[PDB]
Amino acid sequence: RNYPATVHGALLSGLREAGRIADQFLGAMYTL
Amino acid sequence: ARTMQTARKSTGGKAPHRYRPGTVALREIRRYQKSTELLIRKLPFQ
Ligand SMILES: Cc1cc2nc3c(=O)[nH]c(=O)nc-3n(C[C@H](O)[C@H](O)[C@H](O)COP(=O)(O)OP(=O)(O)OC[C@H]3O[C@@H](n4cnc5c(N)ncnc54)[C@H](O)[C@@H]3O)c2cc1C
């Protein structure tokens, strides 16, 4: 949302979804 | 948006009460010019 149609925007979206998937399928040990 | 403008960046859109001296004096002038009561005290005068 904050950086659309840019390179850094897609870069952060990749980091975002990679963190979303890892917390989903590997578990989050930092939230406890 | 404007984040893609590399040249010729478009800058259009974003960034108590006191009375004045002399008033009470004149009002006193109006007050005593209408009355006729004595102004000097009676006992100090006597
Ligand atoms: C003309 C132009 C100029 C740009 N200029 C700038 C600029 O000055 N600064 C800036 O920061 N950003 C700029 N960008 C944006 C930048 O290019 C993008 O952010 C980035 O390159 C694309 O990232 P992405 O991986 O999300 O998209 P993509 O890399 O397009 O991700 C889609 C990928 O999937 C593939 N694919 C597509 N269809 C299929 C299919 N059916 N099956 C399998 N694979 C498929 C594609 O080949 C591609 O590899 C520009 C983009 C364009 C088009």
TrEMBL record, chain B:
Instruction: Give the record's family classification.
Output: Belongs to the histone H3 family.
Superkingdom to which the source organism belongs: Eukaryota
Which part of the complete sequence is present?
A: 2 to 69 of 136
> Which of the residues bear the PTM Phosphothreonine?
T3
Kindly list the places in or outside the cell where this protein is found, as annotated in its UniProt entry: Chromosome; Nucleus
Assembly mode: The nucleosome is a histone octamer containing two molecules each of H2A, H2B, H3 and H4 assembled in one H3-H4 heterotetramer and two H2A-H2B heterodimers. The octamer wraps approximately 147 bp of DNA.
Name-wise, this protein is Histone H3
